[PDB]
Design a protein around this ligand. Structure first.
Ligand SMILES: [Cl-]
Ligand SMILES: [Mg+2]
Ligand SMILES: [Mg+2]
Ligand SMILES: [Mg+2]
Ligand SMILES: [Mg+2]
Ligand SMILES: [Mg+2]
Ligand SMILES: [Mg+2]
Ligand SMILES: [Mg+2]
Ligand SMILES: [Mg+2]
Ligand SMILES: [Mg+2]
Ligand SMILES: [Mg+2]
Ligand SMILES: [Zn+2]
Ligand SMILES: [Zn+2]
Lengths: 77, 91, 244, 103, 95, 135, 41
RNA sequence: GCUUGUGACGGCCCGUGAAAAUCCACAGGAAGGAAUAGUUUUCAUGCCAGGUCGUACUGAUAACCGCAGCAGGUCUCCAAG
RNA sequence: GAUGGGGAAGCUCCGUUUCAAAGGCCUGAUUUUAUGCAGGCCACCAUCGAAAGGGAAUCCGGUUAAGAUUCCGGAACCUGG
């Protein structure tokens, strides 16, 4: 229900002591004037709100996954 | 062009109610629907609300008046009488 | 016979006044220390229409002498009174339109309205639109004031009774023909259930003293004495004379 | 050509039974009950609407911050700027006039 | 006759019409006489008198409304207050 | 016939300080590159001191006599000139065009103005200036 | 002393709100109080 | 274009077209408050609870009333080419 | 439509803020115990009366032989603390 755009803020939410679950969604969509690319959405389940971070760079996306805390339960697709 | 010869605003009543009664309503309908000068702001923006209530579109001033005119003839005489009597009390 | 129409009105079932949209009772301020010794200043906040009343009403706000608050009064507006005007009420008030003064503090020939029959009853006389009271003389002995009433009668009133300088606004209302039954319907819709009226001669004898007969006619003199009882007083009651 | 129905048991077209037709993610037309529109707060003197004040139902004002319900000025959220300007000028001039009457 | 004196200053002298421009002239000290219509609101009239007191400016009260004052200055619109900057061949200041 | 001088007392009419008395420090009749209108640099009172009776103790008198000042550039049309005067030579040098457009210099000038107002209020003088307007 | 001021109040008609005065002469006493006083009179 | 919502206006009245619970703002300045420390739950996040009764179906040329599975009577919303 | 009061042999009638001593939440005072006791504030002075008037807050998808804006999944919001 809420979207965040700052990656530094995203990491703070993942260790907020009330977050237990998260999911990663992959979307195959097209860009403005080119061939389709890969879009990934990182969703953090808070107590009262769901936070969504969307990044359209696949190279920058893989680094975010490796940086997620291990204690967080992550759901794939 | 001129649309009616003599009925004027009372043409909405058609041929009903009699000519004399329609004539009397014509005189008072024109008075109550007219615009009057505001004695406070000097503009011609005073129109009737309810009977006896006259409000200026500008300057937001409401004045109590006659049923179909801002000032009746009797009210004008009362102002002169009070003014004449007031001048004989202080001096 | 049965109970006639004018007898049924006293029970007050369907003949009560329609008072949903009334702004409130129109009264002067309660006669207090400020009124009877000096004067107090009020301000006209708004002039509004009252359902069932031809004359408009004015809302005037005064400060409470003994408490920190504002007290609002409902006056019957006179000609010339406008929003934002200062109203002065008391024994030592000036002779201006809208001011409230005792009858003994104004000269002869002064035009007043909403006059008290007795000091403190907060206005009883000359309340309808376009009506006023003329002061014709003073009697400093016994503290009495002689006035002329709108009906033409002469009355002796106490000099401590209050009145509002001017004439009730909204005059000339009855000069306009109603011109249709619909306007009469809407007029009494805001007053009471008294319209339309069925003539007595159009009824049956059980319904009215004028009812019956192979022609529509009263059949006896319509001048009824003052001493008649309920059910008989229909027509011209205690008429001194008739005809044009 | 889909036709809708009320979602409450009130079957009459009253002020509290207003509906709007919307299309759901299921691809169908469904009635949506809407609340009565709010009215802007009015000035205490001239009666015109107040600038910079949120328009909400009376009970909803308790759920918003004070910023939405006032203006950073004397009488903010109660009287408009022009009416406040009139009060200040009138207060100053009258008080000055009272001094010259005293002497 | 104020009307004749006021008519002469229009053709030769410098004047200013309107409330906003009059206050500016008094604030700058360029004004020498202000003429106020009869039906001017008292609060505005009281403020103009206070400004003229601070700048030592003479005040004249026109015996007529804003409709009449506009005619006297030869204009087809209502004028609430007139500020006289400098007189020409007229002697309104010395009368 | 010019009264908007460097010591004149006026009343603010708009802008979060309406109804608060102020004293003109530096006037600018012929505008400037910024603020292209007749304007003055003024120092005023945002929080007036509270009334002090004889029953108040030593601690409470000091608390109730605190004054919170402000400095502002105001259009002439938004000021109402008075007939009162207040000398500004004690703080005229600290308030100018330079002290604005800089957050640090605004606070340094305000504390100097605060000290001048507090000393003026003590040994009571200019009583009208320090009295809150009622409206 | 330099901070205190003398501000007398005006208690005339139309002026400031009247202060608290002794209204014992005007007290609407209970019924039993009035009857025993009027019995004496 | 149809249905409906809404905005700024205009016409009409001797007709000018509810009340209360409830919520908010302002004026006011009683009190409480800092230096090795406090206040703000009208900013953000986090914790707990939310009782009782109604809820099926018909709503009419067969589920209502007229002795009935009676051509009568019975308030209202949605409305394609 | 109770009460206070006034009627009526009486069943009961009038009246709804009335010729009434008509009532309780902000605390301070107390660490013997729970609230006695100090100021002030406020006098409005039962209750009933709308499943179409006023009114704090929910949506989508799915699910049964028959239930759902009430169950399931997901996503929100209000009130009180
Ligand atoms: Cl009958
Ligand atoms: Mg017959
Ligand atoms: Mg008979
Ligand atoms: Mg007979
Ligand atoms: Mg409802
Ligand atoms: Mg069902
Ligand atoms: Mg049956
Ligand atoms: Mg039966
Ligand atoms: Mg009863
Ligand atoms: Mg109830
Ligand atoms: Mg079902
Ligand atoms: Zn006007
Ligand atoms: Zn306003």
């Amino acid at each position: 229900a809420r979207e965040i755009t700052d990656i530094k803020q995203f990491l703070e939410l993942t260790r907020r002591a009330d977050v237990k679950t998260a999911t990663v969604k992959i979307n195959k969509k097209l860009n403005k004037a080119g061939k389709p690319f890969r879009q990934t959405k990182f969703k953090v389940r808070g107590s009262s709100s769901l936070y969504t971070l969307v990044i359209n760079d696949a190279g920058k996306a893989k680094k975010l996954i490796q940086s997620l805390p291990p204690t967080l339960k992550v759901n794939r697709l | 062009a001129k649309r009616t010869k003599k009925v004027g605003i009372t043409g909405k009543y058609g041929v009903r109610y009699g000519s004399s009664l329609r004539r009397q309503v014509k005189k008072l309908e024109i008075q109550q629907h007219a615009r009057y000068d505001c004695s406070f702001c000097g503009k011609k923006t005073v129109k009737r609300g309810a009977a006896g209530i006259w409000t200026c579109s500008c300057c937001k001033k409401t004045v109590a008046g006659g049923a179909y005119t801002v000032s009746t003839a009797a009210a004008a005489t009362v102002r002169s009488t009070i003014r004449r009597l007031r001048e004989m009390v202080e001096a | 016979g049965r109970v006639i129409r004018n007898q049924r009105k006293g029970a007050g079932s369907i003949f009560t006044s329609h008072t949903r949209l009334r702004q409130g009772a129109a009264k002067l301020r309660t006669l207090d220390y400020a009124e009877r010794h000096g004067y107090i200043r009020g301000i006209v906040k708004q002039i509004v229409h009252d359902s069932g009343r031809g004359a408009p009403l004015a809302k005037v706000v005064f400060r409470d002498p003994y408490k920190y608050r504002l007290r609002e009064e409902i006056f019957i507006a006179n000609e010339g009174v406008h929003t934002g005007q200062f109203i002065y009420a008391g024994k030592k008030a000036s002779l201006n339109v809208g001011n409230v003064l005792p009858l003994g503090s104004v000269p002869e020939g002064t035009i007043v309205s909403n006059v008290e029959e007795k000091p403190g009853d907060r206005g009883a006389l000359a309340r309808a639109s376009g009506n006023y009271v003329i002061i014709i003389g003073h009697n400093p002995d016994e503290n009495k004031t002689r006035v002329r009433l709108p009906s033409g009668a002469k009355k002796v009133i106490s000099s401590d009774a209050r009145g509002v300088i001017g004439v009730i606004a909204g005059g000339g209302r009855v000069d306009k023909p109603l011109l249709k039954a619909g306007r009469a319907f809407h007029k009494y819709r805001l007053k009471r259930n008294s319209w339309p009226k069925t003539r007595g001669v159009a009824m049956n004898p059980v319904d009215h003293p004028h009812g019956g007969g192979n022609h529509q006619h009263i059949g006896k003199a319509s001048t009824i004495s003052r001493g008649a009882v309920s059910g008989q007083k229909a027509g011209l009651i205690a008429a001194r004379r008739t005809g044009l | 050509a889909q036709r809708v129905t009320f979602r409450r048991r009130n079957p009459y077209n009253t002020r509290s039974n207003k509906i709007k037709v919307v299309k759901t993610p299921g691809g169908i037309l469904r009635a949506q009950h809407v609340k009565k529109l709010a009215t802007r707060p009015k000035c205490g003197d001239c009666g015109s609407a107040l600038q910079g004040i949120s328009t909400l139902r009376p009970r909803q004002y308790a759920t918003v911050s004070k910023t939405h319900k006032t203006v950073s000025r004397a009488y903010g959220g109660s009287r408009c700027a022009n009416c406040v300007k009139e009060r200040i000028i009138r207060a100053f001039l009258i008080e000055e006039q009272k001094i010259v009457k005293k002497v | 006759s104020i009307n004749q004196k006021l008519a002469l200053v229009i053709k030769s002298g410098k004047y200013t019409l309107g409330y906003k421009s009059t206050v500016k002239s008094l604030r700058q000290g360029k004004s020498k006489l202000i003429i106020i219509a009869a039906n001017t609101p008292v609060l505005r009239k009281s403020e103009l008198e206070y400004y003229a007191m601070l700048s030592k400016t003479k005040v004249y009260y026109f015996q007529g409304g804003n409709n009449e004052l506009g005619t006297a200055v030869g204009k087809l619109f209502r004028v609430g207050v007139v500020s006289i900057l400098e007189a020409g061949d007229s002697d309104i200041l010395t009368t | 016939a010019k009264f908007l001088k460097a010591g004149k007392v006026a009343v603010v009419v708009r802008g979060r300080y309406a109804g608060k008395k102020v004293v003109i420090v530096k006037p600018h009749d012929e505008g400037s590159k910024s603020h292209p209108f007749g304007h003055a640099l003024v120092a005023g009172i945002e929080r007036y001191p509270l009334k002090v009776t004889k029953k108040h103790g030593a601690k409470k008198v000091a608390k109730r006599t605190k004054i919170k000042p402000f400095i502002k550039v105001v259009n002439y049309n938004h000021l109402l000139p008075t007939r009162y005067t207040l000398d500004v030579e004690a703080f005229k040098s600290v308030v100018s065009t330079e002290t604005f457009e800089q957050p640090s210099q605004r606070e340094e000038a305000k504390k100097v103005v605060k000290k001048a107002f507090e000393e003026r209020h003590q040994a009571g003088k200019n009583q009208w200036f320090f009295s809150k307007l009622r409206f | 002393n330099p901070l205190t001021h003398s501000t007398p109040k005006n208690f005339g008609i139309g002026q400031a709100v009247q202060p608290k005065r002794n209204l014992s002469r005007y007290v609407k006493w209970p019924e039993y109080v009035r009857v025993q006083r009027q019995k004496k009179i």
